Each structure stands twice: as structure tokens, then as C-alpha cells.
A paper describes a structure:
Podophages that infect gram-negative bacteria, such as Pectobacterium pathogen ΦM1, encode tail assemblies too short to extend across the complex gram-negative cell wall. To overcome this, podophages encode a large protein complex (ejectosome) packaged inside the viral capsid and correspondingly ejected during infection to form a transient channel that spans the periplasmic space. Here, we report a near-complete atomic model of the bacteriophage ΦM1.
Here, we describe the ejectosome of bacteriophage ΦM1 to a resolution of 3.32 Å by single-particle cryo-electron microscopy (cryo-EM). Similar to that of bacteriophage T7, the ΦM1 ejectosome is encoded as a three-protein mega complex composed of TEP, OEP, and EP3 oligomers arranged coaxially within the phage capsid. The capsid houses a large ejectosome complex composed of TEPs (, gp48), octameric ejection proteins (OEPs, gp49), and ejection protein 3 (EP3, gp50) arranged axially above the crown of the portal complex (gp35). The EP3 octamer adapts the locally 8-fold symmetric interface of the ejectosome to the 12-fold symmetric crown of the portal by intercalating the EP3 helix α-2 between the crown domains of adjacent portal monomers, forming contacts with the C-terminal portal helix. Through a combination of BLASTP and DALI homology searches, putative enzymatic domains were identified in the ejectosome, specifically a lysozyme-like domain within the OEP (Gly718–Ser903) and an endolysin/exotransglycosidase-like domain within the TEP (Asp268–Asp528). Viral lysozymes and exotransglycosidases can digest peptidoglycan, suggesting that these domains may degrade local peptidoglycan surrounding the periplasmic channel once ejected from the phage particle during infection. The T7 ejectosome adapts by slipping around a pedestal-like barrel created by the portal crown, whereas the ΦM1 ejectosome adapts on top of the portal through intercalating helices which form an analogous barrel. In T7, the TEP consists of an N-terminal LTase followed by the hub domain. However, in ΦM1, the helical hoop and endolysin-like domain are inserted into the hub domain. Further, the ΦM1 OEP has an additional lysozyme-like domain which T7 lacks.
Author numbering:
A (entry chain J): 604 to 771, 783 to 903
B (entry chain J): 303 to 452
C (entry chain M): 1 to 29, 31 to 55, 93 to 102
D (entry chain T): 1 to 29, 32 to 56, 93 to 141, 147 to 168
E (entry chain S): 103 to 140, 146 to 168
F (entry chain I): 403 to 704
G (entry chain E): 102 to 201
H (entry chain D): 224 to 280, 288 to 309, 311 to 321, 356 to 361, 367 to 372
The structure:
């Protein structure tokens, strides 16, 4: 008795929806589950069978119990109502396996978020302490790369109660009564809505360079775009350094972007380091196109 | 020597990136290494550090996850893959299928999750198949008639 | 009823573990051990020193 | 992930190398005769050396010991009472107990004591 | 030697704080502490010490 | 071989590791002849293994663990493609080194007794490769010089990627799956499949396929990916046993073939022994073949 | 200290019963033991007659009453046991003489 | 959802959750399934060579099954109903949903 | 210091070492940066509560000597702290599951009520549910399971 009960116990699934107490089904034996059901875990099949079970019960209210069977010849799944004494009813239904597997995969994709993983994060705000932050984006930039530029924007701009993150509409600016979490949410929304769309399009030109050079350029472009709302200010000098006349570089000191950030601040040294490295890279590769 | 380290914290504690880059670039400048064998070396380390940083976050989902569903939802892998990864992890911890399976079953039972207990039982009853081949009647015998089981 | 045997099962768990763990010890190893047991005979000899050396109740014993 | 097993792999590398060295060490050996005597002699000396080498915190121990003794005493006394229906001792004793006690509703007594339980000493003085 | 000893002492002491969530003694403790300490923002507390920084002894001598 | 493999792994060169693995898996063949059931027995029933196999198993495990430690699963699977079935089974089951010989001995005589079920005529669905396996770290080639030369698929961008790279990766995954399916079918028909199931069989097939992959360079970004056919001896057809020369030599032919047929997305290579000919053909998904074809004699290639 | 004394008196009761000591030797021992505890209590607090010390004294009283009660019953059982054994022994000799 | 309510949620507790600034969407394929219309309704006759009762000359049942249904839903019968009950505790039948046919 | 429940003394101890390292004149600037960065990073790894993490974060980001460090070090430290965060949060939630396992480890009725009264278990679970350490659905089910098991 225990042997038989253990054999049967492994193939039981408790479908949820339709009424109270849900429904109970016993899956049939199959060669390998991955070909028919598309997964070896019952927790996904239980969720996937809900629509089919609900439809079957809606069509035949008089049916009290449901039985499931597999037809290998036509790759088909069959549902049928059952009576006591091992007798069978007249109701029947048929469902192909392909769409069932597609639905299972669709549910799995939603569960795992297309395989990209979770994106929850945190921030360090002076005074206010730790706050929640979501790194999701619509361009496919991996989490630790997205978090790179924000940790520089925060280290440059800072945070104060009367100015927040210095975002310069009504929903993109901090009000007097906002808590730091609300201000951070608005800052993230402003970033995602008004920075990345102007910076991403200009990254198609730098795929010849190594990866880490592109990563370095990304931070500088984001920083410049945040403070100027226009990514063409610094791309001009990047192009000049890579292909233009290097003698025009020192004229950058007359632009408003340099003046606003101070004549000797760390921000400007960080900017000049990138241009000093690009010239060296150009020198070391005379065949650069 | 730099690549011989396998954990993230000690790597940054011993070999800061800003010093590695300078060391490589100074040698490249003095024409001891060609540019192509220095830039690639820098890029490889830059990618490896990000890979390890990502893996360190995925380890926590396995360490603290309570069920298969939320373990998969964290790392992003499919359920069939996290099942195999957990199998390998707990087989490495227990030195074999029996020891790892027992501990995995205990964890599942105490955490109130059927999914983990199922994968533990799979290992436990996969190991048991070795007992079918033993020739019980021809086991070596002790001087007092007591058999000598392996 | 399943819940009556919980204590018995909990006590029986411990027997199985050390039965397998004792077997593992032997596979991982022997002559030196035998010598110590022989020296243990000295304790038996030491315990052999003491061993080698070896008003109504009174009326009741006399009556018996 | 593949990069979270690196530490385990690195630690497990050292196990295989040692396992190979022992095989060679044993194969390079009839010096076993000389080798055995060293341990056979050292064991005796080691055994001989081992043989040669061979407030509130007090009231609590006293309480523990006395509690164990009291439990033991109540045992070996309950046993005689267990035989009351057969012994006829604890019958000859019950006769005397009843005869001397004559010089009830149990529930009534409990209520009477409880009604003044936590003020006996206060009322007495 | 003293570092090893201190590590051992701390490891041995952590055992009761581990069970603090259900031990009865840790309800008498952590009540005595509060009674002997007549919406605290921890972030605000740290900034006060940080601003003084490394001139502590200088500003009091 | 162990020291040569360590040098190759630490120096970030695949060529040296390949020659080390050749020696390592050539030595392992001695384990196939041992009669496990008739080994001399100790007074307490413990068998008495010869010292020649202990130091071989202890070195195989060390080599496998060293390969895995560097994050290079491709050459770790490539190593398991030449060892006998019981040894492959024992290594992947993490166990203390003191019990590896016993595990192998038990598994060998369990196989000899027919306790393993035969595999089906069609490869199990669980042996295929999917995105979850790519995320798991497969196709990681470890250390290397170029970015294109540490991913077996040959894609360059590793930080910012466009959809064009995604399409190429998607096509190449299906290409590898088709190659593995063909290899499995060929092995099954000859009746030479190993006594493995699931992940072990997947690793065996991946290691078999991994050795015949070459990443042609020129033509566009990401180059192209080809799988060389099996040949009796390479020195008669290709003229050399090293892939680094064939990769450079195939460049002109691949570029010409792609120039003639821009619409072709992928290329397949095959060998015709009867006329000593090499054939190129375009391929479609679902293992279907196109109409484009080309022919090249072997003499001029050599 | 109170818990130790409470158990000590009860444990000593049976030890004295088994040795056949007279009641006077038990009473003097009880008084001597009580005196030491009472004197010791003079330093471990003021013994000021408030609620807690009143309860302490109340417990101390019953701690003595219980042992004083049990001491009598133990001897009562022992005497009957000995009487029965002596009566059996007296009956054996009658049969011995009858047979002789 | 409806399949993640069984997650424990011991990683990233509710104290540390926030909405993502972009809308996700799963990667399912655009496929349905629909019941066929031209398939015939195949049934096998196994009562021709045996005695049987025809009602209204479909559903197939047995005599000892049909009789009980008549008595239960037979409140409009002369108190005959007892005879039906007695007989029900004592073939093939065909009607040209059983509880509503009667 | 924090084992006794006094965070202020811990902050004073950290500042004492930071200021002692800063003012020394026998070491070069790069060594001063290295020691400070290593000590600051190591400090986060030893915090045992989510309040200590916030206090130390507030102290560090306001210290003047930390404001002048190179950007690549500030970014690294900021990225490193956020990883010990969410981990000190996951541990505080796994603590309740460990406590529930300990409660369920008993098998006899009398000692269960002698050690774990129901009125205290309910309060312990509901207080955690209130503070958003556990979701309502994983606290109510936990209470119901114990309520049924005891009967």
C-alpha cells in the first residue's frame, strides 16, 4: 500500500482556479517531461493548466471530476469527465502540446523577467541614509554598469534638503514637503526620461575601441548630459582628440561648461584625464581609422 | 600572480585597479610589451572583475533563498538549471550524493518547502541503486562466522 | 496516529547517524592502537590491588 | 554560476596531489621492518608519559545533589505503597492512622484555604 | 596572543545574543537599558561626529 | 602533462593546454584493462590497488579541478571526451580523493552487469542547449588576448551589444545544437555511446564538438564560425594538425563565398573523400539546407 | 540558601530515621540548623518585617512542619515491618521444635 | 502572478521594493488553439443484438440506473412510487444531462 | 563597543584611528589613502544591524577627509557598501524562519507550552509583520500552521 501510494503521490497536481477547493488532477506518465510539458517542475504546470481547466469546467457545469490523458500518436492532450465505479462520461476535450509548451515558456519568462534577473538596488544619500533604487532600463545595460554613473553623479552634485539632487516640469523637481525617497524616485525618472535617450545614440561610433575605453566614455557623456541637457558639447572634443587636430584641445577652457565647474576642481581634472588618455591611445595605434 | 586570486574583497585589498593599469601602461610605454598585448591584458582583468562582482550577488540568492521560485527569480536562471546547480552545490558540501542529499532533505523539511525535499530525495534514491549488485552470499567471513560488509 | 511516534522517531534518528559515522573512521586508518589496550591491563592490575585484598537485626541473623 | 565554485575548486586541487604522493612514498620502499620498531617503541614511552601525567555557585551544586538524593528517597518508598492492596501493611497502618485522626468534602477545604491564601502571615501578626 | 584571546571571548559571548529573540533574560536586559537611558535618526547622529572629524582633540585643548 | 596544462592555463594559451591534454588523456587508457573484480584482498576485505592507478586518478582529478578553477569550462569538458566511462562518472561526482578508486571500481563492474538502461534512438530534450545554459557559464573559454578569442561563438562586444550581435548569437546556438544532434545520431547508430545520462552526456557531446570549431576572421565584424569535418588523418587533407594555420588559410575562401552570396547567413563545410574535394554550402534553421554551393580541391588548400 | 535548607531538612529526616536516633536528637538538630539560617539572614537584608520577609518566614515554618510530620510516619511503618518479621521468626522455631 | 504567491520572499523584503521606471513585457509567441468543426461524432452500436428499451423513437445508460432517476424526480406520481423504489433495489437503454431528459 | 549597545563609542573609536592615520608625517600620501580606504571598507563588513550601517554611512559621507579622495575610490567604496546592505537585510528576515524552525523542533505538548506560550509567539510574529520584515501572507500562514499543529 505504501509503495503504491508513493508511486501515485508524485504525479498529483492541485490546480487552483475555478471554484473553492480548486481541482485535483493526476498527470499521466511520459517518457521525458521536457518534450511534452516543457519543464520538470510541477509548480509551473499547475499555474499553466488553470485556463484549460477553467474553460473545461465552464463548458460542462454538470461534470464533477476531470481526468487527463496523453495520446502520443498525434501529440495530443485529452480531458474527459469521469463517474464513480471507474466508469467514464461523454464529455471530452482536446488540446495540442505545442501551445501548452508555449504557455509554459511564457509563464516562465514572466517569472524570471526574460532571464535578466532582478534589478532592485540601494543608494547612499548624505544625511538621509540608505534608500531604495531600481536600476531597470529599456536599453539593456547591465546592473553594475548602470550603477556606475549614478555613483559619480551623486558624488559630484551632492544632496541638500532645499535643493535635492538639483534637477532642473512639476514631476521632475523636488517640492518642499517631499521625503528623500520621493526625491530619489523623481531623480531616477528624470534620468531615464531625459538622459539615456540622448547618450545611447552616440555610442554607436566608438565600437572600434576596447570595452573599458567605451565604459570610461559612458560616464563622462552621462555627466556632461546631466549638467547641460545636450550631449554634443563634449562629443565634439572627443572627436577632435581621436581624429581632429590636437592643438585645439586647450581651447576647451573657454566654454561655459568648464567655467561653471570651477577652474581647478576635481571635475575638470577627471575630464582632462580622458582626453589625455585618448591621445596616447591614438599615438600607440597609428593605423586607427 | 594577480590572476591567482579567486575572491573579490582580497583582490581589491591587495591589487587596486588604478595601480594595475599604471603598472601595465608604464611597461607598454617603455617598449617592453607591445600595445596589443597590454590593452588585451587590461581588458581581460576589467571584464573578469565585473564577472566576479556579478557572481557574488548571485551566490546570496542560493545561500538565503527559501524556495526554488524565488531563487530563480533572483539569479534569472530557469528552474531546471537552478535545480542542477543546487544539486552540485550540496553534493560538493556533503562529499557525495548520500551526505548532500540528507542535508538537503533536512533543509527542505525544516524550511517547509516541498520542492527542495523533492530534489534531495532524488539524490538520496539515486545513490541507493548501488546495493542491487552486491553478492550477499559470497561475502568474506570472519573467523567467528560474522560476514565482513564493505 | 502518526503524532504518537514523534519522540521515538527523534530518538531513533541519532542511532543511524553514528552507525554510519563510526564505519567511516575505520576506513581512514593501527598497530599503535593495539599497544595501548595491552597497557590497559595495568589498570586492571591496579584495580586488582583492592580486588586482591578482597538490637533486632543481630538476633534475626543469628536466628537464620 | 561558474565563478562561485572557484574557492572550492582551488581548495580541492590540493587533495588530489597529496593522494598521488603517498602512493609513490609507499612504492619506493624492506625498510618497513626498521620503520615499525620506531612506532612500536615510541608507543610505550608515550603511554608511560600519559600515565605519569594522569556565594551562589556552591549553593546551586548543593541543591542539585540534595534534589537527586530526595528523588532517590521518594523512589524505593513509593514501591511499598504500590502493594497496599496485598501487603496488609498499609492496612494495619491505615487502621492506626484513622484511629488517631478522629480526635469529608475535599472541595470545601480548598476554597477555605484559597480565600485567605496570600495573607496568612499578615493576618497572623 | 591577546588578539586570539579577544576573538575567542567575542565568539563565546555571541551565543546568547543569537538566541536573544526567544531567551527570557534578554527581555529583562534591553528593558533595564531603556529604563536607564531616559524617533532617533541614526543618519543625523553620524553627520555630527563626521563634521567635527579629525580636529576633536584640537577643539578641546 | 599536468605541469604543461598548468603552464598553458596560467599563460592564457590554448595551444599548449591542448598538447598537455593530449598526453593527459593518452595516459588514461591504461585503466581499461584492469580486472577490478579479481584484485587481491586485504585481511579485512579491503582491496589492494596497484600504485600505478592511484597516482593517475589523483592527477586526473587535480587537472580537472585546475581547469575548472580558471573559469574555462570549454577545455574542462574537452578533457572528459577521451577518458573511459567509469572514470568520467567518478570525477564529476564530487567525492574525497581517498574513495575515487573504490567508486570507479564499483561503477565499472556495475556497468559490466548491465544495470544501465539503453538510450533512445532520439537524443533527449534535456541534452539540448538553451539560454539558461549560456547564462550558466558554458562557452566560457577563460583567459585570452583578444575579446573575440575568449568566447567560443566569436562575438566581440562584451559590454554594449546591439541586436545584430543577438541575431548572430541566436543563429550560432542553433548551429551548435545541430552539430551536437548529428554527432549524437552518428554515435548512436554505430552503437558506441557511453554509459552516461543527462548532464554527463551533454558535457561529453559538447567536448566532442568543441575540438572541431574554428573562428574564421575576415569578412565582417564577428567574423564567421565553422565546424571542421572529421577526417582519417589531418596531415593528408589539411596539411597540418594545428587549427591556427587553417583558420588563417580559410580566410580567402570564406570571403569569396560570402561575396558571391550576400543573402547567406551561415556556412557549412563538408569533405568528399571520393574526389578529394571540399564543399561549402549555405544552411537554414531547422536543419534544412539551401541551394548555394561551392567546391575547392584539397591540393591548392594544402 | 533557602532552597538548599528546605531540601537538607527533608533529606536528613530519613537519614536519622534509618539510624534509630531518638526524637530529641532530631529536635536539637532541627533547632541548630534553623538558628544558623536565621542568623545568616541578618546580614543578607535587614529582615525588616515587610511583605517579602513575612512570606519568607511563612515558607520557613512549613519547611520544618513537613519534616517533623514525616519523621513520625517513617518510624510508624518501620515498627510494623519489624514486628511482622519478628513474629515470623518466632513461628519458625515452634515448627522446628515440633519436628525435633 | 497566481503562481508566485507561493514564494517566501526572504530576499529583497517588502521594506525594500520599488516600481521600475520602465514597463516590462514577456516574450510569449502569438498562438491560439481552436476546436475543429469537421470531425465526425463517432460512436459504436453495441445493443442491436440484445434486448433493449428505446425512449423517444443520444444517451446510453442501464435500466437499474434509469429507474432511480424516475423515482427521485417523480413527485407528480401516485403513491406506484413505492413500487419504483422496490424495483430499483432489485440491459441497455438509449434516449434519442440524464437528470433533464426525464 | 557595539556588543554593549553603544554606537557612539564605536564611531569615536573609528574616528580616533582615522585621525591618527591622517596626521602622521612618516608615511606618503598613497599609503595614507590605502590605509584609510582599507579600514573604511573593512568597517562596513562588521556591522551587525541596519541602524549601525546607516549611522556609519552618515558619518563617513560627511567626513571632510573622505570628500577629497579620488573619484575612483569613492565610487568603489559606495558600490561596496551597498552589497553588505541588502545582506544585513536578508539576514534579519531569515532570523524569523530560524526561530520558527526552533519552535517547531519540539515534539511534546507540555514542554511546548512551558517554553513557547501562544500569546508570545503571536506577538513576535505580528510585530515583525508590522515592521515590514515579513509579508502578511507568510506571517498569517505561519500562525495558522502552529494553531492547527497544537490542536
Amino acid at each position: 500500500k505504501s509503495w503504491l501510494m508513493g508511486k501515485v503521490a508524485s504525479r498529483t497536481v492541485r490546480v487552483k482556479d475555478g471554484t473553492d477547493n480548486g481541482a485535483l488532477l493526476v498527470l499521466p506518465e511520459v517518457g521525458d517531461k521536457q518534450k511534452v510539458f516543457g519543464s520538470t517542475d510541477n509548480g509551473i504546470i499547475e499555474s499553466a493548466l488553470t485556463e484549460s481547466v477553467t474553460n473545461f469546467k465552464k463548458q460542462y457545469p454538470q461534470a464533477t471530476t476531470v481526468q487527463m490523458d496523453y495520446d502520443p500518436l498525434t501529440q495530443e492532450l485529452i480531458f474527459q469527465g469521469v463517474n464513480a465505479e471507474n466508469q467514464l462520461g461523454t464529455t471530452r476535450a482536446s488540446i495540442p502540446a505545442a501551445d501548452f509548451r508555449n504557455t509554459v515558456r511564457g509563464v516562465q519568462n514572466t517569472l524570471t523577467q526574460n532571464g535578466s534577473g532582478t534589478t532592485q538596488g540601494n543608494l547612499n544619500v548624505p544625511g538621509a541614509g540608505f534608500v531604495s533604487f531600481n536600476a531597470g532600463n529599456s536599453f539593456g545595460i547591465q546592473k553594475n554598469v548602470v550603477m556606475g554613473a549614478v555613483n559619480q553623479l551623486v558624488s559630484y552634485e551632492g544632496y541638500t534638503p532645499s535643493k535635492g539632487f538639483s534637477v532642473l516640469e512639476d514631476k521632475y523637481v523636488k517640492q518642499a514637503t517631499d521625503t528623500p525617497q520621493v526625491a530619489a524616485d523623481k531623480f531616477n525618472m528624470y534620468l531615464n526620461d531625459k538622459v539615456y535617450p540622448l547618450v545611447m545614440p552616440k555610442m554607436e561610433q566608438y565600437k572600434n575601441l576596447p570595452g573599458y575605453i567605451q565604459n570610461n566614455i559612458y560616464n563622462a557623456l552621462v555627466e556632461t548630459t546631466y549638467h547641460s541637457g545636450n550631449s554634443d558639447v563634449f562629443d565634439k572634443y572627443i572627436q577632435t582628440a581621436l581624429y581632429g587636430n590636437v592643438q585645439e584641445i586647450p581651447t576647451f577652457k573657454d566654454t561655459p561648461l568648464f567655467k561653471d565647474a570651477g577652474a581647478g576642481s576635481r571635475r575638470n581634472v577627471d575630464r582632462y584625464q580622458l582626453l589625455g588618455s585618448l591621445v596616447t591611445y591614438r599615438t600607440n595605434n597609428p593605423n586607427l581609422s | 600572480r594577480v590572476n591567482s586570486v579567486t575572491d573579490y574583497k582580497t583582490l581589491n585589498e591587495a591589487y587596486p585597479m588604478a595601480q594595475y593599469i599604471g603598472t601595465v601602461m608604464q611597461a607598454v610605454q617603455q617598449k617592453k610589451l607591445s600595445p596589443g598585448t597590454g590593452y588585451g591584458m587590461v581588458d581581460a582583468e576589467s571584464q573578469r572583475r565585473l564577472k566576479m562582482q556579478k557572481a557574488e550577488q548571485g551566490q546570496l540568492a542560493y545561500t538565503n533563498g527559501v524556495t526554488i521560485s524565488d531563487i530563480a527569480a533572483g539569479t534569472g536562471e530557469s528552474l531546471d538549471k537552478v535545480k542542477g546547480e543546487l544539486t552540485k552545490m550540496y553534493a560538493t558540501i556533503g562529499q557525495g550524493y548520500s551526505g548532500g542529499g540528507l542535508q538537503l532533505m533536512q533543509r527542505g523539511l525544516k524550511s517547509g518547502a516541498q520542492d527542495i525535499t523533492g530534489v534531495g530525495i532524488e539524490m538520496m534514491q539515486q545513490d541507493a541503486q548501488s546495493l542491487s549488485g552486491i553478492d550477499w552470499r559470497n561475502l568474506k567471513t570472519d573467523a567467528d562466522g560474522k560476514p565482513l560488509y564493505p | 496516529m502518526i503524532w504518537m511516534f514523534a519522540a521515538a522517531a527523534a530518538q531513533m534518528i541519532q542511532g543511524g547517524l553514528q552507525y554510519a559515522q563510526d564505519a567511516k573512521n575505520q576506513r581512514r586508518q593501527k598497530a599503535d592502537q593495539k599497544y595501548n589496550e595491552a597497557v590497559r591491563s595495568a589498570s586492571a592490575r591496579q584495580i586488582t590491588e583492592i580486588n586482591t585484598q578482597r538490637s533486632v537485626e543481630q538476633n534475626l541473623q543469628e536466628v537464620g | 554560476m561558474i565563478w562561485m565554485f572557484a574557492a572550492a575548486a582551488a581548495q580541492m586541487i590540493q587533495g588530489g596531489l597529496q593522494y598521488a604522493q603517498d602512493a609513490k612514498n609507499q612504492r619506493r620502499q624492506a625498510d618497513q621492518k626498521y620503520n615499525e620498531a620506531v612506532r612500536s617503541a615510541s608507543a610505550r614511552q608515550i603511554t608511560e608519559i600519559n600515565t605519569q601525567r594522569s556565594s551562589v555557585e556552591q549553593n546551586l551544586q548543593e541543591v542539585g545533589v540534595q534534589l537527586a538524593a530526595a528523588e532517590g528517597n521518594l523512589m524505593q518508598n513509593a514501591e511499598l505503597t504500590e502493594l497496599s492492596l496485598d501487603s496488609s501493611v498499609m492496612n494495619t497502618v491505615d487502621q492506626a492512622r484513622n484511629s488517631i485522626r478522629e480526635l469529608t468534602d475535599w472541595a470545601a477545604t480548598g476554597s477555605a484555604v484559597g480565600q485567605i491564601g496570600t495573607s496568612m502571615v499578615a493576618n497572623k501578626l | 596572543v591577546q588578539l586570539a584571546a579577544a576573538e575567542g571571548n567575542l565568539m563565546q559571548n555571541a551565543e546568547l545574543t543569537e538566541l536573544s529573540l526567544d531567551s527570557s533574560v534578554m527581555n529583562t536586559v534591553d528593558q533595564a537599558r531603556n529604563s536607564i537611558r531616559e524617533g532617533t535618526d541614526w543618519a543625523a547622529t553620524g553627520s555630527a561626529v563626521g563634521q567635527i572629524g579629525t580636529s576633536m582633540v584640537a577643539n578641546k585643548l | 602533462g599536468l605541469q604543461l596544462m598548468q603552464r598553458g592555463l596560467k599563460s592564457g594559451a590554448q595551444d599548449i593546454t591542448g598538447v598537455g591534454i593530449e598526453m593527459m588523456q593518452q595516459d588514461a587508457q591504461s585503466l581499461s584493462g584492469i580486472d577490478w573484480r579479481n584484485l587481491k584482498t586485504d585481511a579485512d576485505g579491503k582491496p589492494l590497488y596497484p600504485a600505478a592507478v592511484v597516482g593517475s586518478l589523483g592527477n586526473l582529478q587535480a587537472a580537472y579541478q585546475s581547469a575548472l578553477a580558471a573559469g574555462n569550462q570549454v577545455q574542462a569538458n574537452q578533457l572528459l571526451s577521451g577518458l573511459p566511462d567509469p572514470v568520467v562518472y567518478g570525477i564529476r561526482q564530487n567525492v574525497d580523493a581517498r574513495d575515487l578508486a573504490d567508486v570507479v571500481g564499483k561503477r565499472a563492474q556495475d556497468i559490466a552487469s548491465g544495470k544501465v538502461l539503453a538510450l533512445p534512438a532520439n537524443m533527449p530534450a534535456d541534452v539540448s542547449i538553451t539560454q539558461a545554459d549560456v547564462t550558466a557559464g558554458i562557452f566560457d573559454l577563460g583567459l585570452g588576448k583578444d575579446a573575440r578569442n575568449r568566447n567560443m561563438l566569436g562575438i566581440q562586444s562584451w559590454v554594449f551589444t546591439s541586436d545584430a550581435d543577438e541575431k548572430a548569437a541566436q543563429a550560432r546556438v542553433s548551429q551548435v545544437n545541430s552539430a551536437m544532434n548529428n554527432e549524437y545520431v552518428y554515435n548512436q547508430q554505430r552503437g558506441s555511446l557511453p554509459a552516461l545520462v543527462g548532464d554527463d552526456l551533454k558535457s561529453w557531446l559538447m567536448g566532442k564538438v568543441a575540438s572541431r570549431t574554428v573562428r574564421v576572421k575576415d569578412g565582417t565584424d564577428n567574423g564567421a564560425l565553422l565546424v571542421l569535418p572529421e577526417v582519417g588523418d589531418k596531415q593528408k587533407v589539411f596539411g597540418s594538425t594545428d587549427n591556427g594555420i587553417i583558420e588563417s588559410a580559410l580566410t580567402e575562401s570564406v570571403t569569396n563565398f560570402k561575396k558571391q552570396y550576400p543573402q547567406a547567413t551561415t556556412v557549412q563545410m563538408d569533405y568528399d573523400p571520393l574526389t578529394q574535394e571540399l564543399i561549402f554550402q549555405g544552411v537554414n534553421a531547422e536543419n534544412q539546407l539551401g541551394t548555394t554551393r561551392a567546391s575547392i580541391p584539397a591540393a591548392d588548400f594544402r | 540558601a533557602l532552597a538548599s535548607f528546605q531540601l537538607g531538612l527533608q533529606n536528613t529526616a530519613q537519614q536519622y530515621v534509618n539510624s534509630g536516633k531518638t526524637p530529641e536528637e532530631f529536635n536539637v538538630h532541627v533547632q541548630q540548623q534553623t538558628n544558623q539560617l536565621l542568623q545568616e539572614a541578618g546580614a543578607q537584608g535587614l529582615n525588616l518585617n515587610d511583605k517579602d520577609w513575612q512570606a519568607w518566614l511563612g515558607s520557613v515554618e512549613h519547611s520544618r512542619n513537613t519534616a517533623n510530620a514525616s519523621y513520625q510516619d517513617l518510624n510508624l511503618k518501620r515498627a510494623a515491618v519489624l514486628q511482622e518479621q519478628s513474629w515470623g521468626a518466632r513461628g519458625n522455631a515452634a515448627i522446628a521444635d515440633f519436628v525435633t | 502572478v497566481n503562481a508566485a504567491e507561493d514564494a517566501a520572499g526572504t530576499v529583497v523584503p517588502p521594506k525594500d521594493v520599488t516600481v521600475p521606471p520602465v514597463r516590462e513585457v514577456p516574450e510569449v509567441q502569438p498562438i491560439k488553439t481552436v476546436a475543429d468543426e469537421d470531425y465526425p461524432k463517432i460512436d459504436i452500436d453495441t445493443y442491436s443484438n440484445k434486448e433493449h428499451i428505446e425512449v423517444g423513437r443520444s444517451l446510453k445508460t442501464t435500466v437499474q440506473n434509469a429507474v432511480l432517476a424516475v423515482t427521485a424526480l417523480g413527485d407528480d406520481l401516485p403513491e406506484v412510487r413505492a413500487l419504483g423504489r422496490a424495483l430499483g433495489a432489485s440491459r441497455a437503454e438509449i434516449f434519442n444531462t440524464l437528470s433533464d431528459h426525464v | 563597543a557595539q556588543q554593549s549597545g553603544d554606537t557612539e563609542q564605536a564611531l569615536q573609536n573609528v574616528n580616533s584611528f582615522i585621525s591618527s592615520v591622517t596626521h602622521d608625517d612618516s608615511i606618503t600620501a598613497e599609503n595614507k589613502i590605502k590605509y584609510t580606504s582599507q579600514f573604511v571598507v573593512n568597517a562596513f563588513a562588521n556591522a551587525n544591524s541596519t541602524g549601525d550601517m546607516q549611522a556609519l554611512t552618515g558619518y563617513v559621507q560627511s567626513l571632510s577627509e573622505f570628500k577629497n579622495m579620488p573619484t575612483d575610490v569613492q565610487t568603489q567604496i559606495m558600490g561596496s557598501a551597498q552589497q553588505y546592505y541588502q545582506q544585513r537585510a536578508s539576514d534579519e528576515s531569515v532570523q524569523l524562519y530560524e526561530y520558527n524552525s526552533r519552535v517547531n523542533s519540539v515534539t511534546d505538548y507540555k514542554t511546548l507550552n512551558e517554553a513557547y506560550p501562544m500569546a508570545q509567539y503571536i506577538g513576535t510574529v505580528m510585530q515583525a509583520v508590522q515592521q515590514k520584515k515579513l509579508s502578511p501572507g507568510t506571517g498569517y500562514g505561519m500562525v495558522d500552521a502552529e494553531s492547527q499543529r497544537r490542536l
